[model samples]
Target: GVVLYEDADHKFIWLGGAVQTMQYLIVDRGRGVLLDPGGLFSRVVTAISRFISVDKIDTIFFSHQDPDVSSGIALWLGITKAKIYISSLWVRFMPDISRMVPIPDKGMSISLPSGSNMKCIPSHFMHSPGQFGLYDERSRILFSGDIGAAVFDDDTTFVEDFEKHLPLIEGFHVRYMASNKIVSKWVEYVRRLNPLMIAPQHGAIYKDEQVNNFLNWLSGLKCGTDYIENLF
Candidate 1:
């Protein structure tokens, strides 16, 4: 898991396990928006309590339906009254896992009392057909769901240098992402924002200049679609 981004108000914890899961909690005043809440629900709750009550969780966003991303859905729903948001493509399937229906659209907008908009952007079929990422207008932090995920042994910190870290990261993208084409399309959409940070559900945080390295790397790579065809 990757501690994608944090300051005093926005803290991201990568709860590593079989999947290198990432969770993000952004505090606006004392209220928080929790993104991709998976792994040990207790750990997330305790970690979040340091700043705000778990009940202060105003919204919960699921990037997709994968166990690595959504395993804590039912538990969180039971504990908090926050509304759940997911892609329009996955709205029906979530009822099987929780009593709630996921809020869906290509995007969802959240406005703050302090006056900036928090938005969810559709990131369809990178791995799952229905996926999304969050963009904070204030921080320019894009909480991407597995879009830039990396899988490896160390869970402590981000890659100091992407070039040296390439070998550790390449296979995960090749095995998990859909294809060069969708990855390229994603790059186009996200680049328009020129986000300050790109935080994936797994892997290290890509910040400052490394964010460009990530986009350039993904643009040139083959992915799961390529592997499946070649493996045979």
Candidate 2:
């Protein structure tokens, strides 16, 4: 089963699996934008159709070019006829997956039918050549690609619920994903945007204080320095 929740501005649909990822649907003035269309599989497509008509997806945004993030582009294009917006960097450096509509450099602002707008921010971390983050100015929600993500099981999918999965999240952060230089750059970029919520691709959403807490801790760690010695 999946989880679907809607606030005043946005709708969130989360799929639970070994590698859980959240697909966000933002509504502004009645227009809809789909973020990180999960893997190009039937399960994700089925889950997405439940809330809104999959054919109504007007725009699709990819945080990065990874399989988990962009693999579903072909499927989406086939079903919805939506324009795929991706980082210009991904378009140049990474192999084109066909059916993607690349956003230009400096990114682009998409005006939704609902009266809100979302801007694509370039975020090229060490993990991938072309990654980006989506910022919704109206709601102050930042669709963080891979940064600030925590590991968790089915029961733990919210930032406030992280305590139950801290150890696992910490291990994944330090050993698998942490990169001081990249993290620092991300901090500086995010600081300028001042997002109120951080909705990540791989994990739960970080809102308000939780978002700040994670950012602060990430900033403290130095490049090439392992914070957890035993783990890494």
**Candidate closest to the true structure, highest lDDT:** 1
Question: What's the CA error at residue 57 for candidate 1, in Å?
Answer: 0.7
Kindly give the number of clashing pairs for every candidate.
0, 7
Model 1 agreement with the true structure over 1-232: per-residue lDDT tens digits:
3344555555544434375566777777678788888765667778888767988888788888888877777788889888777776776766533544454656778785456677888788788888888898878888898887777755445557887767767887888788888888888888898898888887778888888989888888888776786768
TM-score per candidate, chains pooled: 0.87, 0.79
Write the residue-wise lDDT of candidate 2 on 1-232 in tens digits. Answer: 3334456656544444567667777654334578887653777667666666776778888887787787766567778877778876676544435556677755678777656677887666535556778888777888887766655564555577545545545655565444677677778778888887887776667778877877786665553334456546
TM-score of 1: 0.87
Model 2: residues >4 Å from true position, as ranges?
1-18, 92-99, 104-106, 152-154, 161-165, 175-178, 223-232
lDDT (Cα, 0-100) at 135 in candidate 1: 91
TM-score: model 2 vs. ground truth: 0.79
Clashing pairs in 2: 28-114, 28-115, 29-113, 29-114, 29-115, 30-114, 31-114
RMSD (CA, Å), candidate 1 to true, equals 3.0
